[PDB]
């Protein structure tokens, strides 16, 4: 009713129309849908052709088109021509609310985060459930049973280590229970303090975020949903214009095409075991959870928890748990997501597609609506009748396989027979780049931050990670908090308490750390893993000490792409905001030809019960009468960034500059000089990979060069300069202070045929586990990963990469650049590398220097903001924004440059995909053009200033800018100091507390944290930096003090490009180095000539 009143009010005070211009840009007529008197549909023949005489015009039936009463008031936002039928047009109509959505009263348009009155001081952990689960003293005896006797079965290799645990599941015959339900064994429970610590919307989201309008209400209320009307236009004829058909974009015709797995998002194909693991770890369950994505659910956050997941859970008897039951919170298309999904029409044949927009129509500070799928309207008998339907992007993008893209590999863009991966796009646009149809914009990968899981007792000292998993911290980048990771994310809770004391370093569950990783020797695997042969009703948790760093975790447990489609067995979650650029060539004929209604089947459904789930195959023959698979092959190709892979990508990331100040992230152009942030070349000290791990067969396998020396990067560990190459086993992990990990023990030894015992742990280890640790020679130790690299590129272009801070600019809390920062001593605490809480893959000190948080890089006077690795006491730290408020959804028009190149505005950058359609070897395939207006760059809400992009007749795309159109924040903090001030880049970065850093051998082990729950009250001067306004004030950009152009309305144009632009073939290839190092040398040699590499400042001209 409120929205109906608003629409009625706006029907009087607002006027909109679509006026047509001649080829010379002279107005001809208006077409004011709210003022067109006696409009009439086109008189049609029997064959459907609209009677038309060029001079008399289109024939009019004299009666208004359908739904005219409820369509006259809507606003036009898009017009698209047909490619075949002459004089036929479609115009996209939306309500005036979708234009005034932001201006609506706050109490009906709320934010998923609340600043509150702050009567008790700001503390980011207040809204986070943090307390850890504790052993159930009434359910101890149902822990998974160790194998009674390992079946030798001619497996001569014998291990004294603890035997595997049995996981037996068999259907039996009981109606609602299983004879054995081992995966459901549940020995843990939530801590009971001031009530049970668990996720429950009722007691947490009292003022729950909810959409304006449920999807059913959008469908029913015709006047509130988008609608497209096919009308015919002729400028020089008497009857110049007349309408055809009117078709509402029904959200129900979209929801009805959701995969059935999306009726129960709290669940996943894994089911009971992962559901239990997540629930106890306080990570929200499922594959697309309203706890993390409240936009898409009619009831919003009111369903944001794991309760009622669509499968029986929490039963007093574990054998009962795991049965399909009634569900109440399916994925839907409420108002915000819907109107993010309406935009960028394209017409193909007799059908017109709406691919959705960038979502800014309803994108608030802490919520990210996106386009979840493709709406299609198909017209029949020559545009006489029509049918409206839509399909989700998930079923369309299932066919993604690495052989397609030329860019990064193993990205989290895959899915499987259950479409638990929910891609959505902030759509730049859809356009024919020559003969190839291109869809472009930004896309949300599968979650890659929460892929590791904490140990059940280490949630009070990893607040950032636990929040990321909880949905309080809507941050996509991977936070480097590796101390408490479980040895394996996918170990059921039935095997967490098999070693409570931790003295034995329980082989099945221990604090993940690669230093104690088992060999891969035939004897080792035969004795440990292969011996416990698994049957249809038995699977084992192997004693093999599985453990690896972030790269290994993702490689095993992320929906990474594979050479075959629908092959991603491990989908954790979906990113919050679009964390990856995406441009895909779609299949025009297939899109035209696919049927309107989709038909899934039992294969797409989840397993009905655990008995069927256990032997659940990944690939099943589709039911004969189903047609869901046909949709899988839409994407002909795709790309996400420059056509570079591995550390070459991070080397380029070093090359791109930061719009905030323009200085490169590398700081290369000038002994304690600043070091690059992403790449490791010339960082730390070279080490030989031939001395790592087995110390065998690696002199020429990883590095083609004769000398396989690899730059360990920042935060490396070495016995001494004389032994920089490889570190021996002196990272012994003690559980208590009780002595080293003690290799050579009977527990950590394997007896092969004959009993010739030997240790199972490597002699020498790689020289770094730092967040910037790269190791082509040890995937178990390496931390840099392609999923991280893509998000890093997107967020570096956006300019909002967070930084860890120990010391703000306050008096007596100042970080001094001089006499306190020593780049030459990165191994010691003098290097200030946190090693805990930092954004994975980057170096905190280098990032801060680039930002200028310390030094005069960004400000005339040193802000004296930095991170200090204190050694004389405990240290607390918090992540803070970059000071810029660009958001990843900030994507403009998709402008086609020529038959082979296209681009769009992205935040403060204009990015042109030079080499996507027809890639050329050796070219990075991307040209970037930065924005020069400081007022726009540093604005509080910059994307409100972008007023569209287009291709200029001269052949260079340009983007409008109105520095007077910036929309300030909703209010001046009312009248009191609001410590949390929402902004598009604002994130509740939780505090991190870390033990004192060692003076020497600082990073030999993982940097241990301590319970940081109570540390919030002791870091007010750091929490105050969470709000972007305070960071800007520190840097001097807080207010008009930025100065420069006062109004400065004008237009910006991308850098001029030529054939040789983007050529890095010299920087690529390999003759005397490694590819990353040679690319680093190449870029370093061209720091003063970034233009020819496709990086430059966009030319800007003033317009009054």
């Amino acid at each position: 009713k409120y929205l109906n009143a608003v629409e009625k009010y706006l029907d009087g005070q607002q006027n909109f129309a679509i006026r047509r211009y001649d080829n010379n840009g002279r107005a001809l007529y208006d077409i004011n849908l709210a003022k067109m008197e006696n409009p009439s549909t086109v008189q049609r023949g029997l064959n459907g052709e609209p009677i038309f005489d060029p001079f008399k015009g289109f024939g009019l039936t004299g009666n208004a088109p359908t739904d005219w009463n409820e369509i006259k008031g809507k606003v036009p936002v898009e017009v698209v021509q047909s490619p075949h039928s002459p004089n036929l047009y479609f115009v996209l109509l939306v309500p005036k609310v979708a234009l005034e959505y932001h201006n609506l009263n706050n109490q009906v348009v709320k934010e998923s985060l609340e600043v509150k009155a702050t009567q008790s001081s700001f503390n980011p952990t207040q809204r986070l459930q943090k307390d850890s689960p504790v052993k159930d003293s009434s359910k101890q005896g149902e822990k998974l049973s160790e194998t009674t006797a390992s079946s030798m079965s001619s497996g001569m290799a014998t291990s004294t280590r603890a035997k595997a645990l049995k996981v037996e599941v068999e259907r039996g015959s009981q109606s609602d229970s299983l004879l054995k339900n081992d995966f459901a064994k549940k020995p843990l429970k939530h801590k009971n303090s001031s009530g049970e610590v668990k996720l429950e919307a009722e007691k947490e989201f009292t003022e729950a975020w909810k959409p304006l309008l449920t999807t059913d209400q959008i469908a029913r209320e015709k006047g509130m949903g988008a609608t497209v009307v096919s009308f015919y236009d002729a400028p020089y004829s008497e009857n110049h214009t007349a309408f055809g058909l009117v078709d509402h974009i029904d959200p129900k015709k979209m929801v009805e095409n959701y995969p059935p797995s999306w009726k129960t998002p709290k669940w996943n194909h894994h089911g009971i075991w992962d559901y239990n693991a997540r629930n106890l770890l306080l990570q929200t369950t499922g594959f697309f959870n309203p706890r993390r994505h409240p936009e898409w659910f009619d009831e919003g956050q009111a369903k944001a928890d794991n309760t009622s997941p669509g499968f029986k859970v929490g039963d007093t008897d574990h054998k009962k748990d795991g049965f399909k039951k009634n569900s109440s919170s399916p994925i839907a298309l409420p108002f915000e997501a819907y109107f993010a999904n309406i935009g960028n029409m394209v017409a193909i044949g007799n059908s017109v597609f709406i691919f959705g927009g960038n979502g800014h129509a309803t994108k608030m500070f802490t919520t990210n609506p996106l386009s979840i799928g493709v709406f299609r309207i198909k017209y029949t008998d020559n545009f006489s009748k029509s049918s409206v339907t839509g399909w989700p992007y998930a079923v369309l993008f299932g066919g993604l396989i690495n052989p397609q893209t030329n860019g990064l590999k193993d990205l989290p863009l895959g899915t499987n027979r259950w479409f638990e991966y929910v891609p959505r796009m902030a759509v730049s646009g859809v356009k024919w780049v020559g003969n190839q149809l291109v869809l472009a914009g930004t896309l949300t990968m599968g979650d890659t931050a929460t892929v590791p899981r904490l140990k059940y007792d280490q949630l009070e000292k990893h607040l950032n990670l636990v929040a990321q998993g909880q949905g309080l911290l809507r941050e996509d980048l991977q936070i480097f908090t590796p101390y408490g990771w479980a040895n394996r994310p996918d170990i059921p809770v039935g095997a967490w308490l098999q070693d409570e004391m931790g003295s034995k370093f329980g082989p099945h569950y221990f604090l993940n750390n690669p230093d104690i990783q088992d060999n891969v020797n035939n004897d080792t695997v035969e004795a440990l893993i292969s011996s416990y042969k698994n049957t249809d009703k038995l699977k084992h948790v192997y004693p093999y000490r599985y453990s690896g760093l972030y790269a290994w975790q993702l490689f095993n447990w992320s929906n990474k792409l594979t050479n075959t489609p629908l092959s991603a067995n491990f989908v954790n979650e979906n990113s919050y905001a679009p964390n990856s650029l995406f441009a895909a060539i779609l299949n025009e004929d297939l899109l035209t030809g696919l049927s309107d209604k989709i038909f899934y089947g039992k294969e797409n459904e989840f397993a009905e019960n655990e008995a069927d789930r256990f032997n659940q195959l990944l690939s099943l023959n589709p039911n004969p009468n189903t047609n869901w698979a046909r949709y899988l092959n839409v994407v002909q190709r795709f790309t996400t960034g420059p056509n570079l892979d591995s550390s070459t990508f991070d080397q380029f990331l070093d090359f791109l500059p930061w719009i905030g100040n323009g200085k490169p992230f590398s700081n290369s152009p000038s002994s304690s000089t600043p070091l690059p942030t992403f790449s490791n070349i010339n960082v730390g000290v070279k080490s030989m990979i031939t001395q790592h791990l087995n110390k065998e067969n690696t002199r020429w396998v990883f590095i083609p060069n004769f000398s396989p020396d690899i730059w360990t990067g920042a935060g490396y560990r070495v016995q001494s300069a004389n032994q920089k190459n490889g570190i021996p086993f002196e990272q012994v992990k003690p559980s208590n202070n009780s002595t080293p990990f003690d290799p050579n023990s009977d527990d950590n030894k394997v007896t092969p045929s004959g009993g010739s015992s030997k240790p199972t742990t490597y002699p020498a280890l790689p020289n770094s586990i730092s967040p910037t640790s790269d190791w082509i020679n040890a995937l178990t130790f390496t931390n840099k990963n392609n999923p991280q690299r893509n998000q890093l590129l997107l967020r570096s272009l956006l300019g909002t990469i967070p930084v860890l801070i120990n010391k703000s600019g306050d008096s007596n809390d100042q970080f001094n650049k001089d006499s306190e920062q020593k780049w030459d001593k990165t191994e010691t605490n003098e290097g200030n590398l946190p090693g805990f809480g930092e954004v994975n893959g980057l170096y905190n000190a280098a990032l801060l220097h680039t930002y200028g948080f310390f030094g005069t890089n960004t400000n005339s006077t040193d802000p004296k903001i930095g991170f200090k690795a204190d050694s004389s006491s405990s240290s607390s730290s918090t992540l803070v924004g970059s000071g810029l408020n660009w958001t990843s959804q900030d994507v403009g028009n998709l402008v086609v440059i020529n038959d082979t190149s296209f681009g769009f505005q992205l935040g403060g950058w204009f990015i042109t995909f030079t080499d996507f359609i027809r890639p050329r070897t050796g070219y990075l395939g991307i040209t970037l053009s930065s924005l020069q207006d400081q007022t726009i760059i540093w604005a509080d809400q910059p994307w409100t200033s972008f007023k569209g992009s287009y291709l200029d007749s001269d052949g260079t795309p340009k983007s409008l800018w109105d520095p007077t159109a910036l929309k300030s924040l909703p209010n001046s903090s009312t009248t009191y100091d609001t410590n949390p001030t929402l902004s598009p880049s604002f994130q509740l970065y939780q505090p991190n507390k870390v033990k004192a850093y060692q003076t020497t051998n600082t990073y030999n082990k993982l940097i241990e944290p301590v319970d940081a729950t109570s540390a919030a009250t002791n870091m007010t001067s750091l929490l105050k930096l969470l709000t972007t306004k305070n960071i800007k004030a520190k840097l001097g950009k807080g207010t008009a003090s930025s100065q420069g152009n006062n109004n400065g309305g004008g237009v910006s144009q991308t850098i001029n490009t030529i054939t040789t632009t983007g050529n890095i073939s010299e920087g690529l290839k390999e003759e005397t180095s490694i590819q990353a190092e040679t690319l680093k040398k190449f870029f370093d040699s061209k720091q003063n000539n970034k233009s020819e590499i496709g990086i430059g400042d966009s030319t800007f001209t003033k317009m009054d």
Partner: protein, 902 residues
């Protein structure tokens, strides 16, 4: 007029209305004057002439180890029924009825004094079967390189003793040299006969090449374990008689005929035609060593001998790949007394599993998998350490090899002898040998050498002879390197990771062959005495392993292998559990079927010949072949690092992976639309399972659509050269039903197509709307066309809308209303656009239109009859005839009068 196979012998022409022509059903086998024992294999249309390939179940061939006519038909029991290819022309005054034009008979190949030596001791593995198991394929590991060169017991002396055996710097003394034939799948000489039983486990069951041992007792034991229908138990064997019969092996009551007869009958399985030549090649279900080249001008009383594939020196891409294939056949210098093998007699790859044969623009395209062939020892005694063992080894490119496809396939790893095995790389393992050339873990130590696994001293006593496998696999060793080569898991560790191609396993062969060399092939076939070689230039080979997704546990492939993958459950063939959904019981041997070339219907730059690309189905994906019509050669790009552009593999999805590849029936190309169609008939499935259980899902059919994708050649000036191989795309088209016995599909027109099916022993018609590649049902039109009242065409429902729509005529008073009085009859006849105003029409489908044709009836009147567009895109009226016979639909002709005398 669509020619569709009624049954094994009858073929009939169907009208676009999906109705057969009267008396058009013809018994072609009798027409060709061939006894009832014959049946037709495949048919092609070329210049409106119908060709047929005839094969008979009565044929019986014999092989004689001595003499001249070693391969000849068995006329003792009137079994001399050679195959025939017959050209048929529709010779009559319009009306589909066929007649003899030319009948070409195919004779058995002649064997030279050099081919005969090889064939005498050649043994052929029993054919792969739809119900074959991985462990059945598996063969127990043979002697290792150390065991075969230094001997057993002499350990820890490899470094010292490897120099004098020309294996300098060899890093894998434990490298396998093949598999022992003492068990496993039954091998048989050309003059012997395969058994109907298959060993479940090929490391413990089956007697392999020991025919005497198998027949003595093991055959009886297999019969006891597996009877023929269940009363059996199948603890050790599978009775695959039904699945052997289904795929084209002839039987005598219960035992298959001799291997030479089986090979001949399998080789006469496919047909392609050209204005000058006709080529016949074998099917995909068992290797075919010989193919016929037929000269259309040959005299009708002459014989058309084939060519030995061993005489066809295909171009495998690079000479390194060619010699890699040629070096695994057998020992070169045997000279024992008569021990001869394909390599020694200077012969190339002898067997291929030809996916299909097709022609376009007078060019013939052939594609298929390289059938494995490798030496084996037959010393039988002191005895050679390699006694009873096949000499095979994986040839995967080493990890060290420089990146780039050319460098990978040219890497000398395994050029001469086995080097792969098991190894440990940092935190993971790489079955491929890490090094090559002269690289080691401590610098350079000189080139790595390899040599054939046969001890030098016993060179005069080792009897080595060739063999032919039933699948692309070359080295059946139950070992990790073998499984990885089969499943395509070998990946180099460098930054620019790539797949190391097993140059001699799972090798896919494709190419285009021209008349200038088909003539040389014919000359080779005619070659008297010593054989003469044939060179095929425009051909190439690409390593195309089975998808890794078809094996349990192997979730994904990367350089870094999960430790569990070292377990014996995944390392070995015998332990490799198969989840293959494509109807095959195994998931370690690839298989292709249904090559069909086609012309690009889309425009092209003026002065450039229209493109033509060919697609061939394969397990888990579609392989497209790209050609340069400007030279009628494989499309290639200058940058060697890029993969050979002429080949592009597109993986499947679940819908296509679920389509049984063993039920391929026919493939048709829609020339005007540009998409293939792969129709699969479930009825081709055998009657009973391998465990003798009746097959419960023999009813149904399904078709797969293959549409072009990517950027094609010569589209625009900036496309005259390409660096990305044009890639195809397969979809589950939409025509599939499990409850109907299909008869045939009709490429009716661009927007529609029809399928003939039977569900109650009575023919039924349902038409499908072709939505630019995909099909879906349109029931409303289906019933309308079905209402033929037994007539040749659907009748016009004058009172209801039907396939012809509904037409309503305007009253004759409209002549007065529009002031047509002044117009003359001729004047109105001259204006069809004015005739339009006399009737209003309601078409039944999109783009359907109707128009009027009128003729004079008097000085003031004329007669008009309507023309209506039909589903096929042809106008139908009173004068409409299909192959002569009138349709006689009975449209409402009208007469109008009232014209002036002007």
């Amino acid at each position: 007029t669509f020619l569709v196979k009624e049954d094994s012998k009858n073929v009939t022409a169907y009208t676009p209305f999906a109705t057969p022509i009267t008396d058009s059903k013809s018994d072609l086998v009798s027409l060709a004057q061939l006894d009832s024992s014959y049946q037709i294999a495949d048919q092609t249309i070329h210049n409106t002439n119908l060709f047929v390939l005839f094969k008979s179940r009565d044929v019986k061939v014999k092989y004689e180890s001595s003499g001249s006519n070693n391969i000849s038909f068995d006329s003792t029991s009137q079994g001399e029924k050679p195959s025939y290819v017959v050209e048929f022309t529709n010779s009559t005054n319009i009306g589909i009825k066929w007649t003899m034009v030319k009948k070409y008979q195919l004779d058995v190949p002649n064997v030279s004094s050099d081919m005969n030596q090889v064939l005498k001791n050649l043994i052929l593995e029993q054919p792969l079967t739809k119900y074959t198991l991985n462990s059945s394929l598996a063969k127990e590991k043979g002697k290792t390189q150390r065991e075969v060169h230094l001997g057993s017991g002499q350990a820890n002396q490899w470094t010292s003793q490897r120099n004098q055996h020309d294996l300098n710097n060899n890093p894998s003394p434990n490298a396998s040299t093949g598999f022992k034939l003492t068990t496993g799948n039954a091998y048989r000489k050309l003059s012997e006969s395969w058994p109907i039983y298959e060993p479940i486990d090929g490391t413990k069951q089956g007697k392999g090449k020991d025919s005497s041992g198998w027949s003595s007792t093991e055959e009886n034991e297999a019969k006891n374990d597996a009877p023929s229908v269940s009363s059996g138990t199948f603890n050790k064997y599978l009775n695959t008689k039904q699945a052997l019969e289904s795929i084209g092996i002839l039987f005598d009551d219960q035992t298959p005929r001799n291997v030479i007869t089986q090979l001949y009958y399998a080789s006469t399985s496919k047909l392609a035609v050209t204005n000058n030549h006709i080529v016949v090649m074998g099917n995909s279900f068992l290797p075919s060593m010989w193919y016929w080249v037929v000269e259309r001008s040959a005299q009708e009383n002459a014989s058309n001998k084939p060519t030995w594939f061993a005489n066809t020196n295909l171009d495998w891409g690079e000479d390194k790949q060619k010699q890699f294939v040629e070096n695994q056949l057998g020992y070169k210098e045997t000279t024992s007394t008569n021990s001869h093998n394909f390599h020694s007699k200077s012969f190339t790859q002898p067997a291929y599993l030809i996916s299909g044969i097709d022609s376009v623009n007078d060019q013939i395209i052939f594609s298929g998998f390289k059938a494995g062939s490798v030496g084996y020892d037959s010393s039988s005694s002191s005895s050679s350490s390699t006694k009873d063992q096949a000499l095979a080894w994986s040839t995967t490119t080493s990890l060290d090899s420089k990146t780039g496809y050319k460098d990978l396939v040219t890497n000398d790893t395994g050029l001469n002898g086995p080097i792969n095995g098991s190894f440990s790389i940092q935190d993971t393992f790489s079955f491929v040998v890490p090094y090559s050339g002269n690289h080691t873990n401590n610098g350079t130590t000189g080139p790595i050498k390899t040599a054939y696994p046969v001890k030098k001293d016993q060179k005069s006593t080792v009897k080595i002879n060739s063999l032919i496998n039933a699948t692309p696999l070359n080295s059946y060793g139950d070992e990790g390197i073998g499984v990885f080569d089969a499943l395509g898991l070998n990946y180099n560790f460098k930054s620019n990771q790539e797949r190391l191609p097993s140059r001699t396993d799972q090798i896919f062969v494709y190419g285009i062959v021209s008349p200038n060399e088909l003539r040389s092939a014919k000359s080779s076939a005619d070659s008297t005495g010593s054989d003469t070689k044939v060179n095929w230039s425009n051909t190439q080979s690409r390593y195309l392993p089975v998808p890794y997704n078809y094996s349990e546990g192997i979730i994904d492939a990367d350089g870094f292998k999960r430790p569990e993958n070292r377990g014996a459950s995944v390392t070995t063939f015998s332990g490799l559990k198969s989840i293959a959904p494509d109807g095959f019981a195994n998931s370690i041997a690839n298989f292709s079927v249904g090559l069909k070339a086609g012309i690009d219907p889309n425009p092209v730059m003026s002065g450039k010949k229209a493109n033509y690309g060919a697609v061939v189905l394969t397990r888990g994906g579609v392989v497209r072949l790209n050609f340069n019509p400007g030279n009628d050669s494989l499309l290639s790009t200058t940058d060697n690092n890029i993969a050979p552009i002429s080949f592009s593999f597109t993986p499947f999805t679940a819908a296509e992976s679920a389509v049984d590849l063993t039920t391929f029936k026919e493939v048709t190309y829609n020339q005007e639309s540009g998409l293939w169609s792969y129709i699969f008939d479930s009825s081709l499935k055998p009657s009973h399972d391998g465990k003798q259980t009746p097959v419960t899902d023999n009813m149904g059919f399904s078709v797969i659509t293959v549409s072009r994708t990517g950027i094609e050649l010569n589209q625009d000036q900036a496309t005259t050269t390409l660096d990305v191989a044009p890639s195809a795309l397969a979809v589950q088209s939409g025509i599939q039903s499990t409850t109907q016995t299909l008869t045939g599909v009709l490429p009716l027109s661009e927007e529609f197509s029809a399928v003939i099916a039977k569900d109650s022993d009575q023919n039924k018609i349902d038409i499908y709307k072709n939505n630019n590649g995909l099909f879906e049902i349109d029931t409303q039109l289906s019933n309308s066309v079905a209402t033929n009242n037994g007539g040749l065409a659907p009748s016009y429902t004058e009172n209801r809308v039907d396939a012809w729509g509904k037409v309503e005529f305007a009253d004759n008073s409209v002549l007065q209303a529009r002031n047509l009085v002044d117009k003359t009859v001729d004047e109105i006849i001259n204006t069809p656009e004015i005739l339009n105003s006399f009737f209003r029409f309601t078409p039944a489908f999109e783009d359907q239109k109707a128009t009027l044709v009128a003729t004079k009836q008097s000085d003031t009147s004329l007669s008009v009859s309507p023309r209506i567009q039909f589903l096929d895109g042809n106008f139908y009226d009173l004068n409409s005839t299909i192959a002569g016979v009138p349709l006689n639909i009975g449209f409402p002709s009208r007469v109008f009068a009232g014209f002036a005398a002007l």
